[PDB]
Write a protein that binds this ligand. Structure first.
Ligand SMILES: [Zn+2]
Length: 180
């Protein structure tokens, strides 16, 4: 799947070194009324409270709001010290929009993991040494420093289980000539 990264990197962010480039975090906004543009404007003004690296939404748009391979304030202190990137899915009520949003979400999570040298697994293991794509839920369950459970409630409303999300991420990495 093809996408365009819109550069809206927030001016003035800290560029904190990671303890390791071990995770890519899978989020969603939990906001049934916001657009991706609303989310980007809000996070620009409120970055001191929280920020991620990327939004996905608005029909498979990507907006980058922070550089990767530095701390982002997205998932509590324990995940934030080990997250190469943090990718946040915006909501839609439109099935055509969602299919675009979701395909691009899966492609971007795999693209970032591959660039960081992180395995394409979902919610594997239990520690900061278990590299991979991690839901906010897995961070809450295994590391603490947060209680959020995204993105599974939202994916479930669109008929996508955790098992289906794992299999969809593997299908991106499993493409013929995805890698050497
Ligand atoms: Zn989250």
């Amino acid at each position: 799947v093809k996408y365009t990264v819109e550069n809206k990197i927030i001016a003035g962010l800290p560029k904190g070194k990671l303890k390791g480039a071990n995770f890519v975090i899978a989020h969603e906004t939990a906001n049934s009324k916001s657009t991706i543009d609303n989310e980007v404007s809000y996070m620009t003004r409120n970055w001191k409270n929280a920020f991620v690296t990327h939004f996905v939404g608005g029909g498979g748009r990507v907006v980058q709001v922070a550089n990767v391979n530095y701390v982002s304030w997205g998932a509590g202190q324990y995940a934030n010290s080990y997250s190469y990137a943090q990718v946040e899915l915006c909501r839609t009520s439109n099935a055509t929009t969602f299919k675009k949003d979701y395909e691009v979400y899966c492609q971007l999570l795999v693209d970032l993991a591959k660039k960081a040298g992180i395995p394409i697994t979902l919610d594997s293991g239990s520690k900061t040494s278990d590299k991979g794509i991690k839901s906010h839920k897995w961070v809450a369950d295994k590391l603490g420093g947060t209680t959020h459970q995204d993105p599974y409630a939202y994916l479930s409303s669109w008929g996508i289980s955790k098992a289906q999300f794992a299999s969809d991420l593997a299908k991106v990495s499993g493409h013929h000539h995805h890698h050497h």
